[PDB]
Amino acid sequence: PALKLALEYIVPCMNKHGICVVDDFLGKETGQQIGDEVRALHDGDKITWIEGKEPGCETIGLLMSSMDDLIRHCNGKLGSYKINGRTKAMVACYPGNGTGYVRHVDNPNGDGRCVTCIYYLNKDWDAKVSGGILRIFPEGKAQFADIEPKFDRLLFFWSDRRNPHEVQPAYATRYAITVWYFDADERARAKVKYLTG
Ligand SMILES: CC(C)(C)OC(=O)c1ccc(-n2ncc(-n3ccnn3)c2O)nc1
Ligand SMILES: [Mn+2]
């Protein structure tokens, strides 16, 4: 149940460490289905933003609705954030040509995004053999964390400067879906600069 998982794990883990992992998020059957839709969608990296209701993206929509379900039950308990929206789903295809991703902060200048959510959908992926490990350096901590892109794994972490992260090279094609949730106040201040946007 999303309620138990949100209050007994996600909320306390995020407030304590700012990095949270949920394994076996949707089950093998749904995971494979999402892989089929992602592969059929993508058949440097390739990026596509999915709203969830497009033809052939129905199970990606279920993934997004499941994430929303968890964040909903975290209402008002993730720090001081008021999460009132999110981006589309960044459905990314990462090439296995021995390329990694430089260390970066997702939201370094307050663009409204407060929580990064990544779902990994590569069945039987063995990071020990194929690479692609995510390395997060939580600010001010004496440790850093290597997160394997395990199949059906869901990852939460703060999007701001608290979590600089880099990705190690991979040697086989892989896919991940990222979604960012907004903070009401921050996202509002970021929208003021635009005429209409
Ligand atoms: C256009 C905007 C500004 C929204 O782009 C981002 O903010 C953004 C995009 C991508 C990533 N990350 N971070 C890790 C990975 N990655 C790579 C392989 N496996 N995971 C990855 O694509 N982070 C932030
Ligand atoms: Mn990132």
Numbering used by the authors: 189 to 231, 253 to 406
From the study:
Human prolyl‐hydroxylases 1‐3 (PHDs) are hypoxia‐sensing 2‐oxoglutarate (2OG) and FeII‐dependent oxygenases that regulate levels of the hypoxia‐inducible transcription factor α‐subunits (HIFα). The PHDs catalyse trans‐4‐prolyl hydroxylation of proline‐residues of the HIFα N‐ and C‐terminal oxygen degradation domains (NODD and CODD), reactions coupled to conversion of dioxygen and 2OG to succinate and carbon dioxide. Hydroxyproline formation promotes HIFα degradation through stabilisation of its interaction with the von Hippel‐Lindau (pVHL) protein‐E3 ligase complex resulting in HIFα ubiquitination and proteasomal proteolysis. PHD inhibition is a promising treatment of anaemia in chronic kidney disease by promotion of EPO‐mediated erythropoiesis and has potential to treat other ischaemia‐related disorders.
In the related compound IOX4, the morpholine ring of Molidustat is replaced with a tert‐butyl ester to enable brain penetration. Molidustat and IOX4 are potent inhibitors with reported half‐maximal inhibitory concentration (IC50) values of 7 and 3 nM, respectively, for isolated PHD2. The crystal form diffracted in the P21 space group with six PHD2181‐407 molecules in the asymmetric unit (ASU, chains A–F); PHD2 is principally monomeric in solution. Molidustat and IOX4, bind in a similar mode to the metal ion, that is, through bidentate chelation of their pyrimidine/pyridine N1 (2.15 Å/2.14 Å, trans to His374 NE2) and pyrazolone (2.27 Å/2.24 Å, trans to Asp315 OD1) nitrogens; the distance values reported here and subsequently are as observed in chain A of the PHD2‐Molidustat and PHD2‐IOX4 complex structures, respectively. Consistent with the established role of triazoles as carboxylate bioisosteres, those of Molidustat and IOX4 are located in a similar manner in the predominantly hydrophobic (except for Arg383 and Tyr329) 2OG C5 carboxylate binding pocket of PHD2. The structures imply that both Molidustat and IOX4 probably bind at the active site with their pyrazolone ring (at least) predominantly in its enol form, as supported by the likely presence of a H bond between the enol and the phenol of Tyr303 (2.63 Å/2.71 Å) and metal ligation via the imine (N2) pyrazolone nitrogen. The Molidustat/IOX4 triazoles are positioned to π‐π stack with Tyr303 (3.55 Å/3.63 Å) and are perpendicular relative to Tyr310 (3.49 Å/3.51 Å); this interaction is not observed with the PHD2‐Vadadustat and FG‐2216 complexes. The Molidustat and IOX4 morpholine and tert‐butyl ester carboxylate side chains, respectively, extend out of the active site. The interaction between the tert‐butyl ester carbonyl of IOX4 and Arg322 may in part reflect the observation that IOX4 displaces HIF1α‐NODD more efficiently than Molidustat, though the details of how this occurs are unclear and may involve correlated motions.
